[PDB]
Amino acid sequence: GDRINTVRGPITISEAGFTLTHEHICGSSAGFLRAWPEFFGSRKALAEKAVRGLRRARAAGVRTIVDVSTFDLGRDVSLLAEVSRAADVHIVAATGLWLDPPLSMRLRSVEELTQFFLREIQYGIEDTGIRAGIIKVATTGKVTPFQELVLRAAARASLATGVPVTTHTAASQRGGEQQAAILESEGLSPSRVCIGHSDAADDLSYLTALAARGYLIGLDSIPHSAIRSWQTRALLIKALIDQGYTKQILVSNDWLFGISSYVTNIMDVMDSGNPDGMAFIPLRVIPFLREKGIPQETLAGITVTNPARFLSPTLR
């Protein structure tokens, strides 16, 4: 407690400011940006596009992003440090595993995965020293055996360091419920867990029941509807406020500036559907919520206070 690790070193919690808690510089695969940078035009072209997009978001009020790219999403932390410095936006890096682990991860025990997540939080990522400030885990269906090991290793690393856990779900399958059961079996407090992609939920009662248990609800992919409207997703934010669960809400774009882990040219399709990029939350969602009558203090709580509480390393 008192400081959050970022790609340019520790910051105090008051420095984080407006924080987008689920974003990516680049959605890729381990080793890929280094082995084939011209897939993105060039490494310099991707960095320049990410710096302009982050400066765009900064001019709309954002001061920090949490890049929830794991090892297997190709998360290159040296790129994050470079674009963080050039944009003057803090970036929190992640450990954990997403949905494309290679064999060298897939064959590991829970104890081995715990030591890997442990290494990225406590020592540093690769040979850069940059330490992770969050653990990202993805699951599908009812949670596969390997995904259950990842959740348990994540809980273990969280309990030893205080850094929170954030998840990838299918809300339409109520996937947070299985995640929550596994993480609680490990002794992890719900207040150290964000159940992500909860904006895609059709069932408000699924979200209300997780919030009432203390989970953070990641309404984190609002503009993916702009490519069910985005205003319908944003109304889940108002619904949880009106139910008294403002403190449980985290809002983000889930944007990216380059994508190789999908069909070629998807980034162009996405950018034409959401030209605001990571500024979509502050330029479109926040004004929409204001016009629906949500007061300033509540919107500042969601965008500043809740991420600060969530990211502050806590064992209390």
72 makes contact with ligand CAC (CB under 6 A): no
Measured torsion, CA atoms of residues 212, 215, 220, 221, in degrees rounded to the nearest 10: -70
Strands of the sheet containing 19-23, edge to edge, are 19-23, 64-67, 90-92
Among residues 45, 59, 107, 204, the one that binds a copy of itself under rule CB under 8 A: 107
Residue 71 interacts with which of Zn ion, a copy of itself, ligand CAC, none, CB < 5 to 8 Å by class: a copy of itself
263 makes contact with a copy of itself (CB under 8 A): yes
Radius of gyration of the chain (CA): 18
224 is in an annotated binding site: no
261 makes contact with a copy of itself (CB under 8 A): yes
103 makes contact with a copy of itself (CB under 8 A): yes
Scan residues 114-153 and list those touching a copy of itself (CB under 8 A).
115-116, 119-120, 125-127
For Zn ion, which is the closer residue by CB, 117 or 294? 117
Contact 112, 157 (CB under 8 A): no
DSSP 262: S
Q: Mark out the alpha helices in the chain (DSSP H runs).
A: 13-16, 32-35, 43-59, 77-87, 103-106, 110-122, 145-161, 175-185, 204-212, 230-242, 266-273, 280, 286-291, 296-300, 306-311
Give CA angle at 86 (117, 134), nearest 5°: 20
36 makes contact with a copy of itself (CB under 8 A): yes
Which one of the spans 4-12, 22-30, 47-55, 186-194 is the region binding a copy of itself (CB under 8 A)?
22-30
Contact 219, 233 (CB under 8 A): yes
254 makes contact with Zn ion (CB under 5 A): yes
Spacing of C-alpha 289 from chain mean position: 22
Contact 152, 182 (CB under 8 A): yes
136 is in an annotated binding site: yes
CB atoms within 10 A of CB 184: 14
27 makes contact with ligand CAC (CB under 6 A): yes
38 makes contact with a copy of itself (CB under 8 A): yes
Instruction: Provide the binding-site residues for Zn ion, judged by CB under 5 A.
Output: 168, 254
Q: Residues annotated in the binding site for Zn(2+), as ranges?
A: 22, 24, 136, 168, 197, 254
Q: Which residues bind ligand CAC (CB under 6 A)?
A: 27, 73, 168, 254
Q: Which residues bind a copy of itself (CB under 8 A)?
A: 28-32, 34-36, 38-39, 71-72, 74, 100, 102-105, 107-109, 112, 115-116, 119-120, 125-127, 260-264
Annotated binding-site ranges: 22, 24, 136, 168, 197, 254
